Amino acid sequence: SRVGKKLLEIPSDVTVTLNDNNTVAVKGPKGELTRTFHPDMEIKVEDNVLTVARPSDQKEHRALHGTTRSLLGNMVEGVSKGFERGLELVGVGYRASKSGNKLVLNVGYSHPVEIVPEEGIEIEVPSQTKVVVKGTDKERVGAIAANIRAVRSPEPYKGKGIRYEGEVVRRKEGK
Amino acid sequence: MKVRPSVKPICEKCKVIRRKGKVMVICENPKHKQKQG
Amino acid sequence: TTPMANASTIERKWLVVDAAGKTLGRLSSEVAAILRGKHKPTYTPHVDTGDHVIIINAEKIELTGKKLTDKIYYRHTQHPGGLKSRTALEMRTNYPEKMLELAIKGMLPKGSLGRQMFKKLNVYRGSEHPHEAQKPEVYELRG
Amino acid sequence: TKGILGRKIGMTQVFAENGDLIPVTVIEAAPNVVLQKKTAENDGYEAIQLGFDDKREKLSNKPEKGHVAKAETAPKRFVKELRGVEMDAYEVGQEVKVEIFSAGEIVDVTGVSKGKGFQGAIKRHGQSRGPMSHGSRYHRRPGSMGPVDPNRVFKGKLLPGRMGGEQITVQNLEIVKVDAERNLLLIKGNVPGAKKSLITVKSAVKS
RNA sequence: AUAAGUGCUGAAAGCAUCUAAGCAUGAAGCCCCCCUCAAGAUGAGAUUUCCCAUUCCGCAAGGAAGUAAGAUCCCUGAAAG
RNA sequence: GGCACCUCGAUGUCGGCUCAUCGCAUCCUGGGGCUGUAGUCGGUCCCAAGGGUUGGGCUGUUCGCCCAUUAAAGCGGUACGCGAGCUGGGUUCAGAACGUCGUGAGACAGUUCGGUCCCUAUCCGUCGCGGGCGCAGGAAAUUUGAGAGGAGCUGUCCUUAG
RNA sequence: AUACGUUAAGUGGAAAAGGAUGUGGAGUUGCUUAGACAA
Numbered sequence: 090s091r092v093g094k095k096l097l098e099i100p101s102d103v104t105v106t107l108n109d110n111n112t113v114a115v116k117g118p119k120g121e122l123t124r125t126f127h128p129d130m131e132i133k134v135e136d137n138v139l140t141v142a143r144p145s146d147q148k149e150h151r152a153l154h155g156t157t158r159s160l161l162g163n164m165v166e167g168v169s170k171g172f173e174r175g176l177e178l179v180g181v182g183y184r185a186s187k188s189g190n191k192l193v194l195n196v197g198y199s200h201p202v203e204i205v206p207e208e209g210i211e212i213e214v215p216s217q218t219k220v221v222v223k224g225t226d227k228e229r230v231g232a233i234a235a236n237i238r239a240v241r242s243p244e245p246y247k248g249k250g251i252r253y254e255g256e257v258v259r260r261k262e263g264k
Numbered sequence: 265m266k267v268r269p270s271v272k273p274i275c276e277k278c279k280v281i282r283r284k285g286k287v288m289v290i291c292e293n294p295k296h297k298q299k300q301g
Numbered sequence: 302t303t304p305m306a307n308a309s310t311i312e313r314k315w316l317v318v319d320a321a322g323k324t325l326g327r328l329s330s331e332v333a334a335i336l337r338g339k340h341k342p343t344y345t346p347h348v349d350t351g352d353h354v355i356i357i358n359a360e361k362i363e364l365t366g367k368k369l370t371d372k373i374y375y376r377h378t379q380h381p382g383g384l385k386s387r388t389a390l391e392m393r394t395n396y397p398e399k400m401l402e403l404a405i406k407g408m409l410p411k412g413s414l415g416r417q418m419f420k421k422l423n424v425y426r427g428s429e430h431p432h433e434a435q436k437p438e439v440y441e442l443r444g
Numbered sequence: 445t446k447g448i449l450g451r452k453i454g455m456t457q458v459f460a461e462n463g464d465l466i467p468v469t470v471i472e473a474a475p476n477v478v479l480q481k482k483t484a485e486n487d488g489y490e491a492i493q494l495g496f497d498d499k500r501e502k503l504s505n506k507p508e509k510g511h512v513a514k515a516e517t518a519p520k521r522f523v524k525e526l527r528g529v530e531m532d533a534y535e536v537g538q539e540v541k542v543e544i545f546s547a548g549e550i551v552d553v554t555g556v557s558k559g560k561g562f563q564g565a566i567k568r569h570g571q572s573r574g575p576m577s578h579g580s581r582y583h584r585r586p587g588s589m590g591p592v593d594p595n596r597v598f599k600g601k602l603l604p605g606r607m608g609g610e611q612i613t614v615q616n617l618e619i620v621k622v623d624a625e626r627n628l629l630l631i632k633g634n635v636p637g638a639k640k641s642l643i644t645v646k647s648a649v650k651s
Numbered sequence: 652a653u654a655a656g657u658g659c660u661g662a663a664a665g666c667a668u669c670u671a672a673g674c675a676u677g678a679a680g681c682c683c684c685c686c687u688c689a690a691g692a693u694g695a696g697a698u699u700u701c702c703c704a705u706u707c708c709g710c711a712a713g714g715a716a717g718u719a720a721g722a723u724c725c726c727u728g729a730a731a732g
Numbered sequence: 733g734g735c736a737c738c739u740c741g742a743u744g745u746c747g748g749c750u751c752a753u754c755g756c757a758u759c760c761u762g763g764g765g766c767u768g769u770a771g772u773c774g775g776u777c778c779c780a781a782g783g784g785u786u787g788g789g790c791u792g793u794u795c796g797c798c799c800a801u802u803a804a805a806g807c808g809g810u811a812c813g814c815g816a817g818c819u820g821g822g823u824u825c826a827g828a829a830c831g832u833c834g835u836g837a838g839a840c841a842g843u844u845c846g847g848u849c850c851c852u853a854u855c856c857g858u859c860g861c862g863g864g865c866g867c868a869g870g871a872a873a874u875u876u877g878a879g880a881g882g883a884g885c886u887g888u889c890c891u892u893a894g
Numbered sequence: 895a896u897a898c899g900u901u902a903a904g905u906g907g908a909a910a911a912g913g914a915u916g917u918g919g920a921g922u923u924g925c926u927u928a929g930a931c932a933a
């Protein structure tokens with residue numbers, strides 16, 4: 090596992106605490122993330138460098154080693170820099186608006202679609218055609234962004250819908 | 265989705281994968297999406 | 302000359318078995334034998350020589366493989382199209398006592414005496430049982 | 445949940461304000477009494493036991509008299525439980541009157557349906573007759589008992605037997621009027637049972 | 652709670668990948684919700700209330716006899732048959 | 733169709749009627765992928781058996797064609813389900829006739845008109861309804877719900893919006 | 895039961911052409927710290 094073997098530098102502003110049963114808590118300026126890992130993995134912290142060690146070269150271990158390493162890296166990056174996903178509303182009359190904590194989507198349905206973010210996730214609407222999902226947990230930022238995109242996934246005849254920023258929507262010619 | 269006994273690359277961009285103990289082809293071309301069945 | 306146990310001679314102990322982390326079938330086969338009295342040298346086929354068994358932590362019984370999802374408990378109501386089904390996961394969550402009872406019942410003799418032997422089984426979801434009065438000993442499974 | 449026990453008096457009709465003619469069932473429900481409060485601690489579930497219709501002392505027994513003693517009421521002919529009610533609202537001995545309901549409120553009405561005695565498959569199960577002519581000797585019989593292969597009749601082959609006398613709930617009936625003076629509910633439409641039979645009127649479960 | 656399907660994060664396999672660990676979503680279908688029966692559920696459950704510890708043999712075991720609360724026979728009937 | 737293994741001291745045979753029940757290779761409705769999917773429609777494949785799945789004309793018919801509907805007018809199994817449940821139009825006794833073949837008696841998966849469908853339910857099974865005992869005293873009520881059954885279909889219009 | 899392996903499919907405990915980075919054991923061979931392969 091090239092990925093697993095890679096060493097993780099912890100920024101000065103992030104504290105990683107290893108608790109019982111391979112539960113790692115990572116604290117930084119943007120918040121705290123706690124996660125339990127598989128017992129077999131050996132997570133060491135030495136001189137601000139996090140290292141992950143696999144007990145054997147068994148299929149499961151080689152896979153787990155890379156995953157554990159990647160998740161810990163995402164936790165450290167998440168509490169320091171955070172994760173942000175950007176969505177672009179493409180369509181005539183398609184608009185996003187923030188109502189308190191709720192995202193309100195007007196995407197050509199007979200009713201507005203409201204999305205309530207989970208705890209630890211902020212939704213920003215910098216423009217009526219742009220939505221930014223921000224948070225510490227990469228998985229959660231991704232899940233919510235997918236939830237938003239699902240309201241009206243991009244269609245191919247005119248690319249209308251909610252897309253990821255920079256998403257190459259496959260296009261078919263109509264008439 | 266093509267559900268067929270013979271799942272194979274149709275083009276060069278097709279990629280054979282395994283999900284839930286089922287052989288599949290994923291591709292950027294959606295016509296080439298295949299699942300063994 | 303071969304001695305035969307009878308209702309006068311037989312003396313039944315109470316045993317507690319903890320089901321926590323035990324494989325359903327492996328626990329069941331040992332309990333079934335205890336209920337039958339196969340562990341007693343006075344074992345007699347035509348009478349119930351076995352011991353009473355309390356099972357606690359029945360919800361914490363384990364199944365190997367994908368049996369939680371894929372092991373199906375069928376029953377038929379005797380009405381047309383009356384086959385009902387529950388998964389092992391559904392059984393363990395909602396009907397853990399029935400799950401153990403079903404496992405053990407299938408391993409006991411069939412007939413009047415086998416049905417009588419099953420009456421000495423008592424299965425419980427959690428850690429506690431109400432048979433303090435019967436003064437039950439802990440029984441570790443041999444395995 | 446709200447509820448009350450009454451007797452079915454009969455049917456009549458009422459002109460609404462807009463001039464529509466509504467068929468109504470009249471239910472006379474003299475004040476019900478809470479005889480007992482069942483609790484999750486004692487009984488394993490929450491319910492109130494309503495007593496209705498004062499019985500003569502001769503027709504009562506010592507078990508009955510002792511049971512109604514806490515409520516401080518005469519022995520009751522009809523006793524039924526309501527579940528899903530607010531336990532703190534009720535107390536033993538409290539009267540439950542028809543004015544718990546109001547006009548416009550949607551109710552479910554439970555009663556025992558009228559007895560029809562032993563009835564054939566045509567009446568009981570709504571089955572079709574065979575032909576009345578064209579050589580037919582098959583009029584009101586219940587049809588084939590089933591296929592050959594099982595060597596037996598399946599359960600649920602519907603046959604003649606005792607019809608009616610079954611508990612029936614009719615859902616989503618409207619209260620037209622509540623006569624608190626005469627202890628009457630006027631309910632729109634028809635409800636199960638003979639005149640004088642016990643009717644339970646409850647707030648609608650689907651509302 | 653799921654099916655097909657759609658995913659998120661994610662390595663095995665520096666990438667990619669809905670899957671291996673982990674986390675979602677998703678059918679008139681499944682389990683409930685709604686209606687009815689139901690403790691012979693011999694695993695015979697629960698709650699409230701009532702009666703109250705009688706007289707005889709028989710060494711006791713047990714049996715017999717009057718009864719209590721309560722119910723029935725019989726009778727008037729129908730909303731039941 | 734092949735075979736000739738059960739039944740010739742009899743296992744009634746087509747179609748309809750009555751009553752269904754099961755499979756899913758799904759006709760409709762529900763959820764989807766791909767589309768040579770602009771939309772409205774469709775095509776194709778995947779999941780799905782919960783419920784639903786028409787009245788007529790002709791013919792003994794099944795089938796089929798046709799008329800008019802329908803969301804749809806599914807395909808199969810159950811002794812080509814069901815005659816001790818019904819029918820008996822057809823097939824398949826005795827009468828008669830036509831064509832045809834035969835010297836003839838007669839014969840014909842050729843046709844035609846007419847032609848007896850028995851049974852008081854013992855057992856299991858099915859649907860109802862009682863009696864008994866049980867349930868560690870005897871009673872009167874109210875009940876929990878293991879478990880079981882039922883229900884489960886769908887159109888059109890208006891609005892969103894020309 | 896013992897010992898050493900294999901299988902993750904309840905395969906075991908029905909079914910073929912064909913399809914497939916399933917996984918175990920052998921062997922051949924190209925390229926590679928004169929820096930491969932991935933990015």
Ligand SMILES: O=C(N[C@H](CO)[C@H](O)c1ccc([N+](=O)[O-])cc1)C(Cl)Cl
Pocket residue numbers: 742743744745
């Ligand atoms: O011959 C009869 N039936 C026999 C059994 O004895 C059998 O069931 C059968 C029925 C029909 C058939 N046919 O149509 O060719 C042949 C035999 C009597 Cl029911 Cl008449």
Ligand SMILES: [K+]
Pocket residue numbers: 690695
């Ligand atoms: K009982």
Ligand SMILES: [K+]
Pocket residue numbers: 739740
């Ligand atoms: K024969």
Ligand SMILES: [K+]
Pocket residue numbers: 781782
């Ligand atoms: K169906």
Ligand SMILES: [K+]
Pocket residue numbers: 815849
């Ligand atoms: K007949």
Ligand SMILES: [K+]
Pocket residue numbers: 816
């Ligand atoms: K017969």
Ligand SMILES: [K+]
Pocket residue numbers: 855856
């Ligand atoms: K029999």
Ligand SMILES: [K+]
Pocket residue numbers: 904907
């Ligand atoms: K198997």
Ligand SMILES: [Mg+2]
Pocket residue numbers: 270
């Ligand atoms: Mg091919």
Ligand SMILES: [Mg+2]
Pocket residue numbers: 572573
């Ligand atoms: Mg008719």
Ligand SMILES: [Mg+2]
Pocket residue numbers: 576580581583
């Ligand atoms: Mg007649």
Ligand SMILES: [Mg+2]
Pocket residue numbers: 594595
């Ligand atoms: Mg049989």
Ligand SMILES: [Mg+2]
Pocket residue numbers: none
């Ligand atoms: Mg009881």
Ligand SMILES: [Mg+2]
Pocket residue numbers: none
């Ligand atoms: Mg054949």
Ligand SMILES: [Mg+2]
Pocket residue numbers: none
């Ligand atoms: Mg031969």
Ligand SMILES: [Mg+2]
Pocket residue numbers: none
């Ligand atoms: Mg014979």
